[PDB]
Amino acid sequence: YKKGDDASYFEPTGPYLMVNVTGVDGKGNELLSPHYVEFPIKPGTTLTKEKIEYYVEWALDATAYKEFRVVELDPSAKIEVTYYDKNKKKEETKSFPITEKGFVVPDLSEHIKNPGFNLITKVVIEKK
Amino acid sequence: GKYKKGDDASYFEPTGPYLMVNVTGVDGKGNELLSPHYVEFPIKPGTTLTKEKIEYYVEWALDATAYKEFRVVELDPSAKIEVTYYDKNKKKEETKSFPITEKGFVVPDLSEHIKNPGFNLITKVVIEKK
Predict the structure, then answer these.
(1) Is the CB of B95 less than 8 angstroms away from the CB of A84?
(2) Domain of B83?
(3) Which residue from A28, A76, A84 is facing B30, i.e. has the nearest CB?
């Protein structure tokens, strides 16, 4: 048993990536206003820039732009996760940059079962 | 609506540079109390925006909501003011970030590229009732 098919109508019960994307064309005209989607993820995974690109493309498939491809990702994008440290009794936030080498998804089990890894970006997309 | 954000606020887009505040109000124990409401304030290039003036702009952005009686307690130390526009010359989108400090920074004049740039403030702020 792994991490769930079609994904929950409720809040996930495992780590997940929240994708918040704004799709623009090569001229920055906006095509798709912020669109949100959740993908379950497994701690221990290496998230590279290329993987993120695929996830955002998959995020587009539930929109009028499913036939479009991701051309460029905003170079200022970052993954951030916010949780409550159970030892420190405070809000803590970690940032991970999107790079070619990527980063390994941490296990935040000790603090939260289902952390949400936030990805807010703008991407250039064009029809395939 | 039941609480129409915008007493008189311009019906059309701003004609000059403006500061856009989009804060999420939280309590100490990390509970979200107020979701980000869109608020605009005109600003002038040449103005110096310090952390104290930013604190007051966000307290004024709360007066537009049901939390009008709350005061700002502590602004996320990692907040920044970001502005995005298309550069006519290079033909690329470009984004500048300014940190919120005591000394502050001066509002730049981007009018060569856009007449009404939007300086964005998007953070969390710990707020308490007066």
Answers:
(1) no
(2) 1-130
(3) A84
